[PDB]
Design a protein that fits this description.
- By secondary structure, the protein is mainly beta.
- It folds into two domains: about 170 residues, no CATH class; about 160 residues, no CATH class.
- It has four helices and 24 strands.
- The strands form three sheets. A seven-stranded mixed beta sheet has the order 18-17-12-13-22-14-21. The chain has a six-stranded mixed beta barrel with strand order 2-3-8-4-7-6.
- A hairpin with a 7-residue loop joins strand 1 and strand 2.
- One of its GO terms (biological process) is proteolysis.
- One of its GO terms (molecular function) is aspartic-type endopeptidase activity.
- It is an enzyme of class 3 (hydrolase).
Amino acid sequence: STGSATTTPIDSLDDAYITPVQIGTPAQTLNLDFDTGSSDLWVFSSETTASEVDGQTIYTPSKSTTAKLLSGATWSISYGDGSSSSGDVYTDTVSVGGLTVTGQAVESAKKVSSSFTEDSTIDGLLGLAFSTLNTVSPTQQKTFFDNAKASLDSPVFTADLGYHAPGTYNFGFIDTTAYTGSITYTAVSTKQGFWEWTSTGYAVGSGTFKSTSIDGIADTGTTLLYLPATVVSAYWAQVSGAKSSSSVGGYVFPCSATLPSFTFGVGSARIVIPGDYIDFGPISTGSSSCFGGIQSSAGIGINIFGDVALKAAFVVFNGATTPTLGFASK
């Protein structure tokens, strides 16, 4: 079996992408953020503190004839400012683009951090990292992809994110009409539970390609591209007037500048990120300073190939017993 669903940017800057997901019987459709950087499927629900819900569509387990409370199970996911989203757990039927999984753990949020409350377009997250990162206690739960793996024609899913445009998540097959040339596959390390791989280098604009190993994670749940300080400094040095700003928390550049492209290596292949993809607009309304899409990972501790990088490619998440990551131009 296979599944296919359209994913849509939530705003004009492509800050995140939402994908409609059917939960329960009869179906309740929520718009979830597909996140290959986490492993929990959690949703706003009828159990969420009513003051923390501001326009989101909520999942109502009492109206689903197939929902079952998972007795004694809880979940808790930690965030940047010490904030956390947490709640209890149900199992229910979950369908993505015609692909149906029964008995999927649906984590119902009892409280969410303010950052999710502020974002009325995201009803929850669907984690697609490896199941060892799932936070359900005392019994860890499997991701949607893990539960679907057996019935999929092929144990893969693909991300085809659009630039200021809709895109596609496919499960169980590789659409050979969605990319050009060949798919280059590269090894994945699962030791930390991420889709972790090693880029073979980078180039800024039409400069020389620099062969250097960059270990990082493919994370559809992160907007920007976070790379080592040496790489990021080399990029922004080519943008006249660009500087690192502590008040803003990253590199800013004059909005009138034209940004060079950024190339990253996948084996012997090269993925080119157009310079327009790196422009994330004014830091505040009316400002002439614009926020950059390539930022330093020094404070993060891990390099993250986020949406800025992934939307420049057709990306295959191959969940075979030896997992790999595929990249193709499109």
